[PDB]
Amino acid sequence: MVKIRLARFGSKHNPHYRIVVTDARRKRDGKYIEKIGYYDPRKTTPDWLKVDVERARYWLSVGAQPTDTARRLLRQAGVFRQE
Amino acid sequence: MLTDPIADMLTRIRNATRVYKESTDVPASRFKEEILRILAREGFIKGYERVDVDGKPYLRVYLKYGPRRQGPDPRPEQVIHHIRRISKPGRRVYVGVKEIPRVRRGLGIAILSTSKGVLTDREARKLGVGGELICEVW
């Protein structure tokens, strides 16, 4: 089971995540299959969220449960918003 | 027998010029001819021409110097100051077009043999092809 999820970059008290797909069994900040966005929980840039939303839809299509909070973000950039 | 006909040629030339001979022979090969025309075209030799000496083909190379110079030692400046074989039969040398060297901020030249034929470095850069880095002159 492959997962859309968050990997942690940045520094101490400087969290910066990378929206990644990866086999569930890999380490959090381990190797990943593809980067498909990023996310700054502190919203310090005017651009603190981004998602290749075609790709997001691809990985879902081949089946890849997102972390509950990684799907929250995918929602925010309308990965699931249709019509 | 002779191990490097080309290297021998560059030398014959090198040797003749330092005693300021007006001319040298070098036994003849078409590949030798092709190098000669570069020297010729690029202004290092007055020119070559074919002759048959003692019954066999040579190329008579006509050398080219400077004006009689001023003070003690009036020997002319050489036009060919430095002719040097690069790709010897011992260690063959090949640049691709990216690695073709520019001899002496351009004031030099590097005869260089390609599938488009025997070329100067700028000629070959322009034609976009590398090959056997034959020698260099200046």
Partner: protein, 99 residues
């Protein structure tokens, strides 16, 4: 692509198998000179169809033995028992080489 090599058969003194000598050449990594180098391969011959001296193509293949990993594709030219001769000499060279 299954790597396809071509060498010389230098032994068929095995059942359904030929030793093939593949020679390779290249710019020496540090010293420039083009050096030659070579490797014998054990190649699979189900019809004992090839013999001493045939120059043969040779293909990367499904394992047949511990060390049989290639099958004999086509034959390029018969004869060439000169190349065979050269391998055989290097061998008995080693004889006059011990203590």
């Amino acid at each position: 692509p299954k790597k396809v090599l071509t060498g010389v058969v230098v032994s068929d003194k095995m059942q359904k198998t030929v030793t093939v000598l593949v020679e390779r050449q290249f710019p020496h990594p540090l010293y420039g000179k083009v050096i030659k180098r070579s490797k014998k391969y054990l190649a699979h011959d189900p019809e004992e169809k090839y013999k001493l001296g045939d120059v043969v193509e040779i293909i990367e293949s499904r394992p047949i033995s511990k060390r049989k990993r290639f099958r004999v594709l086509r034959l390029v030219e018969s004869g060439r028992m000169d190349l065979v001769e050269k391998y055989l000499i290097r061998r008995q060279n080693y004889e006059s080489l011990s203590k």
